[PDB]
């Protein structure tokens, strides 16, 4: 299984007439979930739960109604797994991975936003053939290449590769070049956009250089972020 961030408070009870939501996102065998905990810190029973998202960069929507079937009584706390997909309307948000959410119950409708970690959008079929990798890297404009630093990393190339693989980031080739390990990696988003990467591991340097090439370079910063998280967790 890939990296899953710990649940964070998305909607505090005091801003939502007692409704408290905490959440995170996961990806389970090709399926994306918004995993939440709803707690009723009010003095009335809560019913009639419903959820919707604003249009967003990767076209993320719930794929079913929110599965809360019984009144959530005062002091009660339930875990809710909401399946998502990427078939919904697309509107480019800033930041690119922001998701606006509305949750309703019988008391009111409440709004909050949260940030989607892009690794849940990394698809299973994201392993480029070596031949295709080289050709695609070359095809993408050199100006699209962006460099980032994975600070303070001490994992071996092998471990880097295995962890990334667990998050559908595939190592296509490894080059040993005078002690340095150069890992060439591919991944593919739910929207079809490929991201190619060169990770440079040097002896004595506690920082790895991650070089990313993408036809949509605005995405790169976000791949870096979760790449960093996967290596640090
Ligand atoms: Cl719903
Ligand atoms: Mg996989």
UniProtKB/Swiss-Prot annotation:
It comes from the Eukaryota. Belongs to the adaptor complexes large subunit family. Adaptor protein complex 2 (AP-2) is a heterotetramer composed of two large adaptins (alpha-type subunit AP2A1 or AP2A2 and beta-type subunit AP2B1), a medium adaptin (mu-type subunit AP2M1) and a small adaptin (sigma-type subunit AP2S1). Interacts with EPN1. Interacts with EPS15; clathrin competes with EPS15. Interacts with SNAP91; clathrin competes with SNAP91. Interacts with CLTC; clathrin competes with EPS15, SNAP91 and PIP5K1C. Interacts with LDLRAP1. Interacts with AMPH and BIN1. Interacts with ARF6 (GDP-bound). Changing residue 137 to A: Abolishes interaction with LDLRAP1 and ARRB1. Greatly reduces DENND1B-binding. The modification Phosphotyrosine is found at residues 33, 224. Phosphorylation at Tyr-33 by SRC occurs at the plasma membrane in clathrin-coated vesicles (CCVs). Changing residue 138 to E: Strongly reduces interaction with ARRB1. It is found in: Cell membrane; Membrane, Coated pit. This is AP-2 complex subunit beta. The gene is AP2B1. Changing residue 184 to V: Strongly reduces interaction with SNAP91, EPN1 and clathrin. No effect on EPS15 binding. Abolishes interaction with ARRB1 and with DENND1B. Changing residue 175 to E: Strongly reduces interaction with EPN1. Reduces interaction with SNAP91 and clathrin. No effect on EPS15 binding. Residues 137-233 are annotated as: Interaction with ARRB1. The chain holds residues 705 to 937 of 937 of the full protein. Expressed in the brain (at protein level). Component of the adaptor protein complex 2 (AP-2). Adaptor protein complexes function in protein transport via transport vesicles in different membrane traffic pathways. Adaptor protein complexes are vesicle coat components and appear to be involved in cargo selection and vesicle formation. AP-2 is involved in clathrin-dependent endocytosis in which cargo proteins are incorporated into vesicles surrounded by clathrin (clathrin-coated vesicles, CCVs) which are destined for fusion with the early endosome.
């Amino acid at each position: 299984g890939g990296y899953v961030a710990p649940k964070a408070v998305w909607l505090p009870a005091v801003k939502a007439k007692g409704l408290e939501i905490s959440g995170t996102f996961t990806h389970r065998q090709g399926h994306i979930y918004m995993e939440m905990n709803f707690t009723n810190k009010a003095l009335q029973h809560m019913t009639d739960f419903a959820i919707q998202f604003n249009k967003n960069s990767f076209g993320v929507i719930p794929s079913t109604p929110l599965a809360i079937h019984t009144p959530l009584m005062p002091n009660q706390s339930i875990d809710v797994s909401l399946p998502l997909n990427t078939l919904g309307p697309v509107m480019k948000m800033e930041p690119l991975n922001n998701l606006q959410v509305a949750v309703k119950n019988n008391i009111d409708v409440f709004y909050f936003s949260c940030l989607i970690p892009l690794n849940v959008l990394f698809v299973e079929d994201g392993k480029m053939e070596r031949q295709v990798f080289l050709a695609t890297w070359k095809d993408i404009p050199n100006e699209n290449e962006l460099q980032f630093q994975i600070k303070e990393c001490h994992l071996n190339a092998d471990t880097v590769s295995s962890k990334l693989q667990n998050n559908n980031v595939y190592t296509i080739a490894k080059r040993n070049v005078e002690g340095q390990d150069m890992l060439y990696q591919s991944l593919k988003l739910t929207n079809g956009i490929w991201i190619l990467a060169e990770l440079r591991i040097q002896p004595g340097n506690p920082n790895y250089t991650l070089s990313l090439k993408c036809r949509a370079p605005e995405v790169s910063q976000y791949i870096y972020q979760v790449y960093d998280s996967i290596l640090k967790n």
